[model samples]
Structure formats: C-alpha cells, structure tokens
Target: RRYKWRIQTAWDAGTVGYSLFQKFTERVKELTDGQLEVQPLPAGAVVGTFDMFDAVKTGVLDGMNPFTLYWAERMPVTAFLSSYALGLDRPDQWETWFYSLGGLDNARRAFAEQGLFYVGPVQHDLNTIHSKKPIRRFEDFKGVKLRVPGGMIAEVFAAAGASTVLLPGGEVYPALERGAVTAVSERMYPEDGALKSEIKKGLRLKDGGHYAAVVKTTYKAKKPVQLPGAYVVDIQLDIVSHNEDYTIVEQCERAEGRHAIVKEFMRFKVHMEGSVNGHEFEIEGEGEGRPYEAFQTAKLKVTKGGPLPFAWDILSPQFSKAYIKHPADIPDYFKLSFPEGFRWERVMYFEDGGIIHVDQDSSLQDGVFIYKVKLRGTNFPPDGPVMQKKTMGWERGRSAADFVGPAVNYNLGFHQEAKYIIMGPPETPAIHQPVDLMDFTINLNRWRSLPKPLQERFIAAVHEYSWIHYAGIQKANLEAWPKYRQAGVEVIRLGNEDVRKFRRLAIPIWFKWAKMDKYSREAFASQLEYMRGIGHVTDEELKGLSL
Candidate 1:
C-alpha cells in the first residue's frame, strides 16, 4: 500500500474494542485495493490519551481514534457529538443523524476549528457506568465521585449532585481498584440487558378463597453490572388500581434531575372500602380477574401498581431476532404491551413531597433485559434461570423490539419449556440484539495532501467497513446457535401472523416518544422515511399506525 498512516485508538491493545479496530484497518486495506494502509496502536502509544486532539492536528500522529467526547475539553459542542444519556436510542439512529440530517456536517465544524479532519463516526457499543455500589436514582448521585469524559455530561452529573472527573482509559482501572473513583464507563457482552426479577419486600398471600396480600418487587440488571442505557421495568400487580379499559392518569412527584416519580398507576374508588396490610384490595373497577401467582405463569393482570423508576446491541437475542426480521413488529409488540392509553407518565418529586406530571411515558426508550446470566458470581443456582420464567409483557414487548436474534439461547431454565425455547407468547416467536464506532482525527494538511480520489476511496472504505462489521457480528451470532443447540437449547420461529401482531403492538410507543423533542421527532421521521423508501414499511401501514 502506497498510502500508510499510523492511527492510535483510546482502547488498550488486547481489548475487544481494539481488536475490532484492527479488523477495520485490515478491511480498509482490502476495500482500498491496497492503496491505503493503517497501523493501529493502543492508547498512549506516542502521546497521553488526553492529548490525541493536539497530537493528530500537529502530525505527531497522522490520526487518532477516540470518542468525540474525548475532545469536549477543546470544544464543548463535541460533548453531544458522542452519545449521551437518553439521547438517540439506537446506533442506526445516530448514523442517520450524521449521514442525512447534518450531524456529520455540524460535527465537522467543531473539528475544523481545531485544524483536524473529522473522518466521521464509527459506531461502537454504548458506554456503561460501573459503580461500586448501587446508584439507582438521582438521589443516589449525591457526593459520589465519578469519572466521565469532558463536556456537558460532567456538568449534568454535577448538577445532579455528582462529582465527576476526567481520566484516560489506561488509568481508569487503577483508579477504580484504589477507590479513587467509584465508577467506570465501559462496555459489555452480547447477552447483556437481561431482566432479573425479585421481590424487594412484602408479598401477597391468599388466606382462603378471597385473595389478599401486600408485596413489593423489583426486576432489573440480570448481569452483574448496570446498563448505561434505559430498560423497561414493568410492575404488574394482581390488584391493580386501573383496568385495561381505563385511561391511566399519571402525576409526577419529582423530576429535578435524572430521576422522576409518578402516581405509579390510576386510582380507584372503593366500594367495600378496606385496606389489607396497608394495601387497598376493596375497589370498584374493571380488571382482568386473575389471581396473584408470584410470576408462576407468564400471564398476569395488573392488580396493584406503584410509581417506579426505569439498548439494542446488547439487547436480548430473542427480541433482536424479531427486530432484524421484522423491524416494525417489535415496536408494534410494545404498543399492545404498553398501549397508548395505558401509559406510565413521567413525574417529578416535589421538595415537600408529591408528584406532578411532566410528560407521557413511552416504551420506545424502554427495552427488555432478557439474557442468560452467567451463573458465576450471581445469587442464583448454577443450573437454573434467574428470572425463572419470562412474563407475558416481556415476551410481547421488550424482547422483540430491537433485533432478530434468539429469545433464549441456552437451557438455563429448569423446565420443559426449554424445548420450545422461544420464550414468548403464542403470538411470539423467537428473536434476538451497540455496535461500536471507530472515530479518527487526522491532520487536515495530510488528508488534503492525499489524492482526491484516494480521499474519496478512504471515506468509502469506512462506510463499507461499518456495514461489514455489523453484518459480521450478526453472522457470528447466527453461527453460535448450533453450539447452543449442542448444549441442548431449542429454537422456534414465530408464525407470520404473530410477527405482524408483534409489530402492530409496538408502533404507538414509537410515535409517542418521537413527539418528546424536535430531535427525536426528526430522527424517527428519518428512519420512517428510509423504511418506506426501502419498502420495509408501506404507506397504507403508515396511515394505519397512530399513537
């Protein structure tokens, strides 16, 4: 290759992130027909990790690969350039924003000021916040020492009462071990974001024919680490305050920072007028009269609800399968599972104590956490599934919304259902789930010195590599199925009708969240337009869909 350049990444040499980058460089060589060659180096190869911006601009390094946020100290606008908490929800959405909606152009301006050539975003896995202790709510951030990239992310966390720091990728682990910092932002495995359920406190018990009891439960973080992105946590009680037919009126109690509180569910007028162990059982309302059974069966009617708190690459394989096969079906499944009329609206907590409405909640940002928890280091027995069995709500909505992978790959459950291991409703069939990005800052002069055709070819190669990377990962997942089958895992396919219904149910949630902001609305519109353009979604079907 006549064109050779050394590019260093922010990742360690042996890490998977670095390995993926190596493959991209190799593929770039192939795509350019040996016209260009890239030598990949780990962080700190020539300059301090934080100095990549200056290094790449001055030609100490031809190019440096790191997150956009890594340069946030130099340009405040770059903070939002990389993904942030609760930003665009998917990797593809971010790509769309960059390629079509002026994201890349706007971003280029920031880099242009520093005299560096922006080589476009390379999608990677979403970053995760790792903490020594459970930091669940906005209140939990108080006085916590955290490390984050420079920019508004640190500012936002600081505003929420967190103390944030800037550190290089190499020094993060030592700081974590020595207790210099409490959290580290990192990545995860393929079967991440799985839902693990458990009762935190009190439970309902039947004392004869009249069912009555009180319970407190929670289900999240199936794996050891907390997911940086949003995941759905549905609280279904046998004694619900509202029915499927009624509109859920939500009021937020507090929404000062990252956390919000709402009136959990709708209220009911008491007919018999009584309390059972601090829980209201006597109510005058319509409900699916199913008895409480400790998640024994997948089907459960909302009996009691409470105000509570709340990814795709790392999404459940089961749901990912549906997403890849029928992109619209997963969202449709969400629509039916958490209908437009049945919403958990966002609320903010008052200093005095009460919740007031902020905005209507949608399942679009909320995804399912369904994956195999490696039995090591968990509280569960070695031979059984942690959540025990999948819920009806999980099966229909959360699992299938993101991609087309398997629902359950391994026989982690201790039941006969593993034979039909799709882990969804009768209408549900098996499915599957960042993709990572490779970003580069090259000396503008060097980039300009290259032949115009060569520059075009280099750009074209990165684009080709992006698709090649994603498709290869999908292929790898497909190949793993036989290994799963070898280990006694069964596979099932959803019927065509089931797939259609799944998509139908999740559509409203998609429209609901898009209206939250201009950017979101724009992002959804772009995706929808592309879908229709590609004949993935029909115009008649679009009209039929509504929030």
Candidate 2:
C-alpha cells in the first residue's frame, strides 16, 4: 500500500503562498516516484491557522507549512526564525545565516521542543508600507498614524516619531478609507487590480462620462495608429510683446568653391515685457542682456559672395580649459541650519532592555552648525543633562517571559513589500526594511516516520523548493508595479539622502535590540559582523553615525 500524508498551509486558498505550497507538495510526491502521496490544504482545512502547531504535534495533521514566528506565544526565540525590522538586509544574508551559520541548528532546536520538524524555511519576500501620503524623508514620519503587525515594526516606527496602531486585517480597510489612519504596512500585484476597480468606480459618473478628458487631452492624428490613447498635459505659456522695432540690413557676402550664389538670408529678434495676474515679468536686450536685468537676442544675414568666412571658422570661438575634467570630480555638498534652542531627541527601545535617549549636541561656527549625538540612558528623575547612571539594564529573554514580550524582540531579514524594484511603481525604488514575513516548518515525528529513501528524496525536494519558491514570488511581486501605475496609484520612493539618514538613525536601535535572548543576540551579532566585514559599515563611522 502507498503511504499518504496531508499537510496544511498557513495561508488562504487564493494567496500566492498557497500556490507555492501546492507546488512543494507536488515536488515531494514526484521525487518519491509516487511511493508517497502528499495532499496540500489551505489554512483552516483541518484547524485554525494559529492552531497548526498543536494540531501537527498531536497527530491531528501530519505536518504543515507555517510562519515560524506565529508560534511565538509558545516559542519566543522563533522570532529570530522569521525576521525583525532593521536586522539582516537581503535574501542572500538570511540564506547565509541559515546554512553557513548555526541558524538551522538553532531553528531545529526551537522546533524540536514542540515536537515539530524544522524542514527549513521556504523563504518569501519582505514587507513594506502603503501610505496615503508621501513619506519623502525620515522626518516625515513624525505624527503620521500608521498600522503595523506589532513587534519591532511598532517600536521602530514609534522611535521615528509615528503613532503606531494595531488592528485586525479586516478593519484596516475602512479605517484607511475614512482617514482613521494614514498608512498601512502592505504590498502590490493583486492589489493593483483591486485598486483599479475602485478608482474606476470613484471616477465614473451615472451619465457614462468620466472626468478623464477634462484636464487631459485626446490626441487627434491624421495617420493610422494605436487607438483610444490620450495624453494628460500640464503646460506653461509665455507671451512676449515687443515695444522696440528691430532692423537688419545686409549685402551679398561671399561665394564658396563648387556652388557659388548670392544667398541672401536675414533674421531678427526682439525682447519685451508683459504681466499676468498682477505679477510683472519682462525681457530686454541690447546686443545682450546683463545680469538678470534683461533677455538677449541677435540677428544674422548671409548672402554668399566670398565663401562666408567658412561656417566653422566664423562660428567656433577660442577654447578654454575645462572647469571639471571628470564628472566624478564634482562635489555634492549640503548645509543644515536649525533654529536656536532646537534640540532633537528620540527614544530607542531595546527588546528586553529599557529605553535610551539619542541626544543631539549642537554648536555653530560662523553661523554654520556641526551636529553630533550621544546615546545615553534615561535619567532616574526624568530631567537632567548629567545623570550618575552610565548604563541601564532590563531582565534578559523577555520574549520568553510573556506573550507581549516576544512580540517586541527582533531578529533580521531583508523585506520586499510590493514596493520593491521592477515590482513597484515604474520609477519608484524598493522600500528597504529588515523584516521578511514567513517560514516553512513540519512535525518532527511525522517526518521521521517515513522510510529512509523516501525521506532522502523528500528532503532533497524541499532543499530545491526553497530558491524556486523565492524566485517565483519575486517574479510575481515585480509584475505588480505596472498594475499599480495602471490603477492610478501614486507610488513614492524614498530619496537616497533620506535613506542614508534613516540608516544612520537606526544603527543604535540595532545594537540595543540584540539583548533579547541568545537567539536574538546571536542572530544580530553575526549579521552585524557580516555587514562590517562587507564594508557596509566602518568602525569609526559606526561610532559617529553621522550620515
């Protein structure tokens, strides 16, 4: 008789994750040469999504694919198994940690405690924010109302000056529509089609007329071409009236070698002024305009007689050395000036550790200011520049202490919300975050029950399944951007300078949160070492953190 297994996935039936789960099961069956048959079921097929762990452990289900961190109430260190904000920065980094470092070993121990088999992670993409307003800079997060899925996301956003709220997925829609909140952390793809339909409903009128063409123009061409195309234009017009008459007089000039003729050509130009809506704008020229006071114009005449002094010889001027020999030689410099008594301070929260203040030290030299900040513990009395305490500590492994405690402890992974490149709006850059959403796991006893050869083939299939699933999700995620633009959604990409400032501001938070537990500490310490080894951060600059 053939062996049969039923596995449940922690994703709804229509989701991209469920589709990948089906493929994985098929791969396992194929590798076993039909000796074993595996059935993949959507979430809640045999039990509730969060109950999968116990269901699998008690033999109600053979095994399952789940978000490793969902079992955080029972296994706090599992947070490192999934990811946390500002942790690892890319897929390769997470992959390296799992295979090269002791990541798999750590994860296996965590799963074995619950009698679950850690089949290893089938990685997915990162999480990102979809905002109703533009977050152009790191400072723009101040006072914005944001909804996050708890843990380090809420803490980091709060540190960045936002008011964070937690709500069930069903309630996020109306809250966003009615302006209860300004942004929700989410992604693109299927979101495009849904948004497109909503926009059409919002803009469509009962008379079958759309506001589409009032501000936009429909092209009228006399040639055969693509149909139903229109252009929306915003134009600036300038009308100049001439008060001075211009004259140009010329006689026959010269003649060239083969073709000889009395070629007569005369053109003249003038400058004047006009005002619109009570704002005066003018232009004047005499041979040339001087220093923003007037515009310049000229005239030319050519009647071939003596070769016209050779066009190149007459037009070319004396050459001078270049101002910059190479484009890289150009300097990109900026200035920052803050009002007197403007002190910038923020709270950086560590998981099992209390808060520390990021305090700024400001001084000016000839009206130019240099800013530096120090990381200091919160004073006991709550208001003092000099507190005797140099360091503050909290109970360690707070995640294992309570449900809420583990939610705040963080580990790292690269995030790619629907906002990542090629998968985001055409011109927008990927939103970078150190949090990826899910992981794959199984029941330990169920896995070992299989025959050795069957287990070998099934395990190989799982190993192959990892990267294949990632590439597929990435492919689909990238395709969502065009859909986003088509749906008329405005996509905003953070500026490079702004991102640099964000990274600089977040460095201390990274160091602080590594204190949660051994897993949290190990994951972060190793990741930080990798970053420094790759020259992503320097020891001297990390100390200063002046981006």
Backbone steric clashes in candidate 1, count? 73
lDDT per residue (tens digit) for residues 40-124 in model 1: 8887888887787888888988998776666655565554455543234467777876898677766676677778888777655
Can you write out model 2's per-residue Cα lDDT over 1-547, one digit (the tens) per residue?
A: 4778888876667666678889888877778778888889987789877678888899888888776666644665665665554456577877887889778887787678778878777666665465544455566565555665555545666777666665432234344332331121101111211110000001112232211100111111122222211111111111122112211211111111010010122121223222211222232222211111112223222222212211111011100001101122221001011122123333433222333443333333333332333333332232211121222111110000011110011111111111211112322233333435455565677778778888777767777887787777677666654565654545455566655555565666555555666666776677677768878677975784321
- The models' CA-based lDDT, in order, is 0.42, 0.44
Reference-based lDDT, residue 154, model 2: 58
Clashes of each: 73, 16
The superposed Cα distance between candidate 2 and the true structure at residue 105, in angstroms, equals 1.2
